[PDB]
Amino acid sequence: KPMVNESDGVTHALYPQEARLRNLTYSSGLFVDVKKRTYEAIDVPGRELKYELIAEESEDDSESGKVFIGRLPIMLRSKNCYLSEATESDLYKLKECP
Amino acid sequence: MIVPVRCFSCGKVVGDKWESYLNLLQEDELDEGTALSRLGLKRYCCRRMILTHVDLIEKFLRYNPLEKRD
Amino acid sequence: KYICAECSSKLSLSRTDAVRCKDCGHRILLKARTKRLVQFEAR
């Protein structure tokens, strides 16, 4: 869900009011899993190279495997946005126009 | 936006009658024309003032001048 | 003087203090209207 990290490094969820007043950008972050493999073969001239699996780095079992890749803007009232499930009193306390 | 105090055309005053006009509509379950004529609104300009009023003051009132979003 | 944006708490801030609310910790602060009413002439 959309959120912002200030210059102090503190992280707080970003809401449209703060983006409007403070000149921010309504957006969220994208996380992608990455896996790496290393293959080594003996280069014998005149013969095809036969590589074998030696090292495979895959951090799927830890939260460090999610590589941060960038930030994507979010359109209002879409599935991800907080406004999607807000009732009338929710919109008023957050001060939306119904 | 609260009801205009005076009529823009014939100078009459309609501001005070809004509260009593709203009463006749649901407590007495009358129609709009007879309710409008029950309060001495006879020129159709006064009927225009009362009949076509959008009361927007009850929406701003559930709200604060601080933190609207977009 | 100033005022908070969520709870409208009454705060006073110097020229060096951080622009934050003490109770809610928000970063949006509003001023306060001139307490002494001042008469004017529209010209």
From Swiss-Prot, chain A:
Localisation: Nucleus
Signal peptide segment: none
Residues passing through the membrane, by range: none
Role description: DNA-dependent RNA polymerase catalyzes the transcription of DNA into RNA using the four ribonucleoside triphosphates as substrates. Second largest component of RNA polymerases II which synthesizes mRNA precursors and many functional non-coding RNAs. Proposed to contribute to the polymerase catalytic activity and forms the polymerase active center together with the largest subunit. Pol II is the central component of the basal RNA polymerase II transcription machinery.
Similarity field: Belongs to the RNA polymerase beta chain family.
Note: The binding of ribonucleoside triphosphate to the RNA polymerase II transcribing complex probably involves a two-step mechanism. The initial binding seems to occur at the entry (E) site and involves a magnesium ion coordinated by three conserved aspartate residues of the two largest RNA Pol II subunits.
Subunit structure: Component of the RNA polymerase II (Pol II) complex consisting of 12 subunits.
Protein name: DNA-directed RNA polymerase II subunit RPB2
Native source organism of the sequence: Saccharomyces cerevisiae (strain ATCC 204508 / S288c)
Swiss-Prot record, chain B:
PANTHER family: DNA-DIRECTED RNA POLYMERASES I, II, AND III SUBUNIT RPABC5, DNA-DIRECTED RNA POLYMERASES I, II, AND III SUBUNIT RPABC5 FAMILY MEMBER
Self-association state and partner proteins as the record states: Component of the RNA polymerase I (Pol I), RNA polymerase II (Pol II) and RNA polymerase III (Pol III) complexes. Component of the RNA polymerase I (Pol I) complex consisting of 14 subunits: RPA135, RPA190, RPC40, RPA14, RPB5, RPO26, RPA43, RPB8, RPA12, RPB10, RPC19, RPC10, RPA49 and RPA34. The complex is composed of a horseshoe-shaped core containing ten subunits (RPA135, RPA190, RPB5, RPO26, RPB8, RPB10, RPC10, RPA12, RPC19 and RPC40) where RPA135 and RPA190 form the DNA-binding cleft.
Encoding gene, per UniProt annotation: RPB10
Cellular component terms per the entry's GO annotation: nucleoplasm; nucleus; RNA polymerase I complex; RNA polymerase II, core complex; RNA polymerase III complex
Name under which the protein is recorded: DNA-directed RNA polymerases I, II, and III subunit RPABC5
Subcellular location: Nucleus, Nucleolus
Binding site for Zn(2+): 7, 10, 45-46
Function: DNA-dependent RNA polymerases catalyze the transcription of DNA into RNA using the four ribonucleoside triphosphates as substrates. Common component of RNA polymerases I, II and III which synthesize ribosomal RNA precursors, mRNA precursors and many functional non-coding RNAs, and a small RNAs, such as 5S rRNA and tRNAs, respectively. Pol II is the central component of the basal RNA polymerase II transcription machinery. Pols are composed of mobile elements that move relative to each other. In Pol II, RBP10 is part of the core element with the central large cleft.
Cross-link Glycyl lysine isopeptide (Lys-Gly) (interchain with G-Cter in ubiquitin) residue location(s): 59
Coiled-coil regions listed in the entry: none
Taxonomic lineage of the native organism: Eukaryota, Fungi, Dikarya, Ascomycota, Saccharomycotina
Record-linked NCBIfam families: PRK04016.1
Gene3D superfamilies: Homeodomain-like (1.10.10.60)
Gene Ontology molecular-function annotations: DNA binding; DNA-directed RNA polymerase activity; zinc ion binding
Keyword Oxidoreductase: no
Curated annotation (Swiss-Prot), chain C:
Record carries keyword Nucleus: yes
Zn finger limits (C4-type): 4-24
Keywords of the record: DNA-directed RNA polymerase, Metal-binding, Nucleus, Peroxisome, Ribosome biogenesis, Transcription, Zinc, Zinc-finger
Miscellaneous notes: Present with 907 molecules/cell in log phase SD medium.
Places the protein is found: Nucleus, Nucleolus; Peroxisome
Assembly information from the UniProt record: Component of the RNA polymerase I (Pol I), RNA polymerase II (Pol II) and RNA polymerase III (Pol III) complexes. Component of the RNA polymerase I (Pol I) complex consisting of 14 subunits: RPA135, RPA190, RPC40, RPA14, RPB5, RPO26, RPA43, RPB8, RPA12, RPB10, RPC19, RPC10, RPA49 and RPA34. The complex is composed of a horseshoe-shaped core containing ten subunits (RPA135, RPA190, RPB5, RPO26, RPB8, RPB10, RPC10, RPA12, RPC19 and RPC40) where RPA135 and RPA190 form the DNA-binding cleft.
Protein family membership: Belongs to the archaeal Rpo12/eukaryotic RPC10 RNA polymerase subunit family.
Taxonomic lineage from the root: Eukaryota, Fungi, Dikarya, Ascomycota, Saccharomycotina
Residues of the full protein shown: 28 to 70 of 70
Entry GO CC: cytoplasm; nucleolus; nucleoplasm; nucleus; peroxisome; RNA polymerase I complex; RNA polymerase II, core complex; RNA polymerase III complex
UniProt entry tagged with the keyword Mitochondrion: no
PTM notes: The N-terminus is blocked.
GO biological processes: nucleolar large rRNA transcription by RNA polymerase I; ribosome biogenesis; RNA-templated transcription; termination of RNA polymerase I transcription; termination of RNA polymerase III transcription; transcription by RNA polymerase I; transcription by RNA polymerase II; transcription by RNA polymerase III
Residues at which Zn(2+) binds: 4, 7, 21, 24
Name under which the protein is recorded: DNA-directed RNA polymerases I, II, and III subunit RPABC4
One of the record's GO molecular function terms: DNA binding
